[PDB]
From Swiss-Prot, chain C:
Belongs to the universal ribosomal protein uS13 family. Part of the 30S ribosomal subunit. Forms a loose heterodimer with protein S19. Forms two bridges to the 50S subunit in the 70S ribosome, contacting protein L5 and the 23S rRNA; these bridges are straddled by the 5S rRNA. PROSITE patterns: RIBOSOMAL_S13_1, RIBOSOMAL_S13_2. This is Small ribosomal subunit protein uS13. It comes from Thermus thermophilus (strain ATCC 27634 / DSM 579 / HB8).
From Swiss-Prot, chain E:
It comes from the Bacteria. Zn(2+) binds at C23, C26, C39, C42. This is Small ribosomal subunit protein uS14. Belongs to the universal ribosomal protein uS14 family. Zinc-binding uS14 subfamily. The keyword Zinc applies. Signal peptide: none annotated. One of its GO terms (cellular component) is small ribosomal subunit. The gene is rpsZ. Its cofactor is Zn(2+).
From Swiss-Prot, chain F:
Involved in the binding of tRNA to the ribosomes. Part of the top of the 30S subunit head. This is Small ribosomal subunit protein uS10. GO terms for cellular component: ribonucleoprotein complex; ribosome. Coiled coil: none annotated. Part of the 30S ribosomal subunit. Forms a tight complex with proteins S3 and S14. Also contacts protein S9. The gene is rpsJ. Belongs to the universal ribosomal protein uS10 family. Pfam families: Ribosomal_S10. The keyword rRNA-binding applies. Keywords: Ribonucleoprotein, Ribosomal protein, RNA-binding, rRNA-binding.
Curated annotation (Swiss-Prot), chain G:
It holds the Pfam family Ribosomal_S9. It comes from Thermus thermophilus (strain ATCC 27634 / DSM 579 / HB8). Keywords: Ribonucleoprotein, Ribosomal protein, RNA-binding, rRNA-binding, tRNA-binding. Part of the 30S ribosomal subunit. Contacts proteins S7 and S10. The keyword Transferase does not apply. Part of the top of the head of the 30S subunit. The C-terminal region penetrates the head emerging in the P-site where it contacts tRNA. HAMAP family: Ribosomal_uS9_B. This is Small ribosomal subunit protein uS9. GO terms for biological process: translation. SUPFAM superfamilies: Ribosomal protein S5 domain 2-like. GO terms for molecular function: rRNA binding; structural constituent of ribosome; tRNA binding.
Length: 80, 24, 118, 206, 60, 98, 127, 155
RNA sequence: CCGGGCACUCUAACGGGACUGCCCGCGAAAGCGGGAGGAAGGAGGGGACGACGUCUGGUCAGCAUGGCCCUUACGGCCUGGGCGACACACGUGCUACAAUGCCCACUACAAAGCGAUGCCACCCGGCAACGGGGAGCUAAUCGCAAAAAGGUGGGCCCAGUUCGGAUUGGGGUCUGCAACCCGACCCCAUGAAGCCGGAAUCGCUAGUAAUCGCGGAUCAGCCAUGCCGCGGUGAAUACG
């Protein structure tokens, strides 16, 4: 039960950046402070470092995780 | 009773509408 | 009265007795009785071989059911588990997923209480 | 921890609002803000002029700001000069084209807020508070005023520990709302601390 | 409360959702009545003063 | 049809203004239906007494907007001769819809 | 001709008109037994006429409104009482000793703050 | 009751019989403030009890409630250490209340499915001299005549 | 609905009305017991109101304020995150463990409030949340609106169930710049514990307890089962 209902929202920040990164070949680590945006298909293959609120953690983006968000793989919490 | 959201009493307790409690 | 992948209700009302199938609740039972053209208030014993065979025709292949449904749900768990998703982590640690509080009353998902000292 | 504000009790019977007009959903908020701005301005400037009550009334874009003064000479000013500046500064904040009105209050010792201001003044220059208290209650009692009461706050005379002062006279029944009990609060800001001054004055029956 | 935190008054909040009441007199952070523009403490004191017309002592 | 919507925070003020209007209009006009009273809009506000709890101490106040209706029938000139602007009350509020 | 009694019970109003007739009582376009169908206390509404031996001597038409149907029944009782008194005042001698002319002033009591419903206090545990 | 005698509430008479004990029993059957449903329970039970045995439910009700009323009971009194069970007689009002309470509690502790059936059969058994309510009554009375050794602690 | 009319219910402003006044009793008096009359009585019921002071009670984290520390810095903007963490422990509650019950149609009766892009009758689409269209109400006239328990009818048949809805998988609407952290809601499916609760402990003396729904403030939305009000039905018991 998760819903965006139309024009699935992806922030311009990484949108234009990655759609221009794809044109020159795959790039290495990217900078991401916007975990509010949705993952889109052409993101597969990169390595995206997202913000925990404190840290910068790299995430390998694959075909399986397209429908979800950036931040499902950056755990804010730390326990045990 | 009131917690069952797919029955009519659970619909009137939440005040919502649907298939198990149509409006009219 | 065998209908789906092995499923034998008996001695009750048919629409009620269909809830005992895995992928059928009251809604799908009413839908089966609706489109199959069968009296819902009938007992299971009085079900015609033709009525039973039509219920089998509909219920068997319109929705995914017992073994397929259990394996599909479990494989969905495994699917969002093998990915590094946070939801998969909540399924790993055995904690509620829908976004509840875990300070108190996480009993259903976390199991019986294991009381450490303090 | 008891004894709610007396004028808030009194608002219904034997007391009236400092603002009496009408509004709705879309108007009440900033109109009340404008009233607060008016009272703010008049408490900035007219404190030493001996003012007690500001009654603001509105019919329809008509404002009727009424200032009750113990000394109208400082409000009117020589040749009316001072009823020009701050009466224009009043309209330089609100574009409602508002006019100003003055009124006389007899016996400045009979109005409780004025007595509070007086005792707070004598406290700020650090007089013995109890003499100011009893003298104020006598000023009240020497002209009608079947009851009078004065309360002062802690750190009296600059003392480290906080205390509570006293010396009412007559009869001051805050419990029963019958007989037009007036109340005034003042704030004495001094080097040692802050002293609240409560002046209760009881006059009339019905 | 804090002066800068009344930044709502210049609203321009970059997003329409970020508008909160911020009781005018006391600069209330949490609990504000929208009809008076004041907060429960400021409303209490102002209704005690007698500057809010029509406000009486409720009793029944 | 001359509807006169009277509204206020004070009931005696409404009675004063409405009765003055009807007394003015009674010297010229018809068997005027006169001062009908309408239900009052009651806005209640519960406030916790002390800042920083003592939750169960709250007291409430109530504002009430009173409404009255006039409904003058067949007024011509002398009615509005005593109508233009002659009233004292300030807290009263008058509307006219036709 | 016709006699009138109003009565009132627990936020209910039951205008009662009594005339001579056979004993047929109607309410709001329904007979007395169709509108109050299956209510065990519905017989108490025509109880005030059993000290005067009506229902064969009388006939009624009632219009009731407000509250619940039990308050409607009791307001019907009181209204029948006052109509019976205005018909024949001597009936008072047999009415008030029965108690049918007394307005039941029991009203639901307002809810107070700090409580759940107007008297129930919230439960504390370990004082 | 520190000051006053706590004057007893005078219940309204009944619409069917005209008797007050019937209204009291119907109140004892009522729960959550449903006197209508409780009255329907008692009167369907009245029909059932008048049919299954060809007697008037009036006198059977009266005889049952009379059979369940006890004549002695026990109250605890603190004397010289831990308290003791002291027997004593019963007030008529308290006999009425206890009889009706035992009636309802023994009726609902019965196996019968419907409420009115439980009420009717409980009233029948109590009117015959047997049943659960009379068993609780006779246990209350068996508390007396047993600790009668404390008959000098009456108070 | 209309013509029309205020008698009625009603709405809301002023009044009348209860005072132990009448009688019996007891008493030195207040007063007490009983009775009539009365809508009502011995304070008719409910509020608002909380004394001199107490506990160095509570908050300078609402405000105002006396002193001591901060100054490319505690001040200041913004993004992200947090206040939602969990092997545990209590407090307050919500829903329940069913047959005086559940569900399904059908039908009747409240009071108090709220609504100018705000409440949204009505038609259409959709199983639905909801969307499109669109009338009216500056609201005793319009709308929220259906009250719910109840009534008759029906099915269930003592069974972890046509009890109970937690958990979880999927699909979807909506407010919003944006629902991973972390929203509500709808639909399909999954249908957990729980079959009246150990020691102990809580509320309530009359429309009260119990139960049933309704509304409101704050608020774009809402984790509100909270809080503050409203009425429906309506007890048990008080020897002491
Ligand atoms: Mg740990
Ligand atoms: Mg269910
Ligand atoms: Mg002053
Ligand atoms: Mg001094
Ligand atoms: Mg007074
Ligand atoms: Mg400050
Ligand atoms: Mg906000
Ligand atoms: Mg807010
Ligand atoms: Mg609270
Ligand atoms: Mg009430
Ligand atoms: Mg209630
Ligand atoms: Mg507490
Ligand atoms: Mg007409
Ligand atoms: Mg007349
Ligand atoms: Mg007497
Ligand atoms: Mg008497
Ligand atoms: Mg009497
Ligand atoms: Mg009283
Ligand atoms: Mg009183
Ligand atoms: Mg009273
Ligand atoms: Mg008093
Ligand atoms: Mg203190
Ligand atoms: Mg402390
Ligand atoms: Mg300061
Ligand atoms: Mg918290
Ligand atoms: Mg409608
Ligand atoms: Mg009108
Ligand atoms: Mg109308
Ligand atoms: Mg109108
Ligand atoms: Mg049935
Ligand atoms: Mg089990
Ligand atoms: Mg089940
Ligand atoms: Mg069972
Ligand atoms: Mg009491
Ligand atoms: Mg809301
Ligand atoms: Mg939540
Ligand atoms: Mg609610
Ligand atoms: Zn404030």
């Amino acid at each position: 039960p998760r819903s965006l209902k139309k024009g699935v929202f992806v922030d311009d920040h990484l949108l234009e950046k990655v759609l221009e990164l794809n044109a020159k070949g795959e790039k290495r680590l990217i900078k991401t402070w916007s975990r509010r945006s949705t993952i889109v298909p052409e993101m597969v293959g990169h390595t995206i470092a997202v913000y925990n609120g404190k840290q910068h953690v790299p995430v390998y983006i694959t075909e399986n995780m397209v429908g979800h968000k950036l931040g499902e793989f950056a755990p804010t919490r730390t326990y045990r | 009773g009131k917690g069952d959201r797919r029955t009519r009493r659970g619909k009137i307790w939440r005040g919502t509408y649907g298939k198990y409690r149509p409006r009219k | 009265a065998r209908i789906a992948g092995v499923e034998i209700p008996r001695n009750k009302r048919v629409d009620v007795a269909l809830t005992y199938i895995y992928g059928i609740g009251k809604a799908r039972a009413k839908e089966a009785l609706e489109k199959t053209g069968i009296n819902p208030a009938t007992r299971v014993k009085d079900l015609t071989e033709a009525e039973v065979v039509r219920l089998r025709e509909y219920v068997e292949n319109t929705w995914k059911l017992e073994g397929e449904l259990r394996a599909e749900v479990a494989a969905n768990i495994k699917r969002l588990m093998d990915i590094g998703c946070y939801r998969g982590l909540r399924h790993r640690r055995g904690l509620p997923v829908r976004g509840q509080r875990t300070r108190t009353n996480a009993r259903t998902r976390k199991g019986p209480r294991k009381t450490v000292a303090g | 921890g008891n004894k709610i504000h007396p004028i808030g009790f009194r608002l219904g019977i034997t007391r009236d609002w400092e603002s009496r007009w009408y509004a709705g959903k879309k108007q009440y908020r900033h109109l009340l803000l404008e009233d607060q701005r008016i009272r703010g301005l008049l408490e900035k400037e007219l404190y030493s002029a001996g003012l007690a009550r500001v009654d603001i009334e509105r019919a329809a874009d008509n404002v009727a700001v009424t200032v009750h003064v113990a000394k109208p000479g400082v409000v009117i000013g020589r040749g009316g000069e001072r009823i020009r500046v701050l009466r224009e500064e009043l309209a330089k904040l609100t574009g409602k084209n508002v006019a100003l009105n003055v009124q006389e209050v007899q016996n400045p010792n009979l109005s409780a807020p004025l007595v509070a201001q007086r005792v707070a003044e004598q406290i700020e220059r650090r007089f013995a508070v109890r003499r100011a208290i009893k003298q104020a209650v006598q000023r009240v009692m020497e002209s009608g005023a079947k009851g009078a009461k004065v309360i002062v706050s802690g750190r009296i005379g600059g003392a480290e520990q906080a205390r509570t002062e006293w010396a009412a006279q007559g009869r001051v029944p805050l419990h029963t709302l019958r007989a037009n009990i007036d109340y005034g609060f003042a704030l004495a800001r001094t080097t040692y601390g802050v002293l609240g001054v409560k002046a209760y004055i009881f006059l009339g029956e019905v | 409360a804090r002066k800068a935190l009344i930044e709502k008054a210049k609203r321009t909040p970059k997003f329409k959702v970020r508008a909160y009441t911020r009781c005018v007199r006391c600069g209330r952070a949490r609990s504000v009545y929208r009809f008076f523009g004041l907060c429960r403490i400021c409303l209490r004191e102002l209704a005690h003063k007698g500057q809010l017309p029509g406000v009486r002592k409720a009793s029944w | 049809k001359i509807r006169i919507k009277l509204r206020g925070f004070d009931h005696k003020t409404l009675d004063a203004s409405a009765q003055k209007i009807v007394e003015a209009a009674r010297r010229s006009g018809a068997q005027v239906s006169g001062p009908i009273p309408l239900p009052t809009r009651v806005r209640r506000f519960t406030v916790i007494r002390g800042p920083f709890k003592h939750k169960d101490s709250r007291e409430h106040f109530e504002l009430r907007t009173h409404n009255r209706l006039v409904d003058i029938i067949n007024p011509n000139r002398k009615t509005i001769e005593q109508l233009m602007t002659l009233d004292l009350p300030t807290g009263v509020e008058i509307e006219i819809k036709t | 001709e016709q006699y009138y009694g109003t009565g009132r019970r627990k936020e209910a109003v039951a205008r009662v008109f009594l005339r001579p007739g056979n004993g047929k009582v109607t309410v709001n376009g329904q007979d007395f037994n169709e509108y109050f169908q299956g209510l065990v206390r519905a017989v108490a509404a025509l109880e005030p006429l059993r000290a005067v031996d009506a229902l064969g001597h009388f006939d009624a038409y009632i219009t009731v409104r407000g509250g619940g149907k039990s308050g409607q029944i009791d307001a019907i009782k009181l209204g029948i009482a006052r109509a019976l008194v205005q018909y024949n005042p001597d009936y008072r001698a047999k009415l008030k000793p029965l108690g049918f002319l007394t307005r039941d002033a029991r009203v639901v009591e307002r809810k107070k703050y700090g409580k759940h419903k107007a008297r129930r206090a919230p439960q504390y545990s370990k004082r | 009751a520190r000051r006053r005698r706590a004057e007893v509430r005078q219940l309204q008479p009944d619409l069917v019989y005209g008797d007050v004990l019937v209204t009291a029993f119907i109140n004892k059957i009522m729960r959550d403030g449903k006197k209508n449903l409780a009255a329907r329970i008692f009167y369907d039970a009245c029909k059932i009890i008048q049919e299954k045995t060809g007697q008037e439910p009036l006198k059977v009700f009266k005889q049952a409630v009379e059979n369940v009323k006890p004549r002695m009971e026990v109250r605890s009194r603190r004397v010289g250490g831990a308290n003791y069970q002291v027997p004593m007689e019963v007030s008529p009002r308290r006999q009425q209340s206890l009889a009706l309470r035992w009636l309802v509690q023994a009726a609902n502790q019965r196996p019968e499915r419907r409420a009115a059936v439980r009420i009717a059969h409980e009233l029948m058994d109590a009117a015959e001299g047997k049943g659960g309510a009379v068993k609780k009554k006779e246990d209350v009375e068996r508390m007396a005549e047993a600790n009668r050794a404390y008959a000098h602690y009456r108070w």
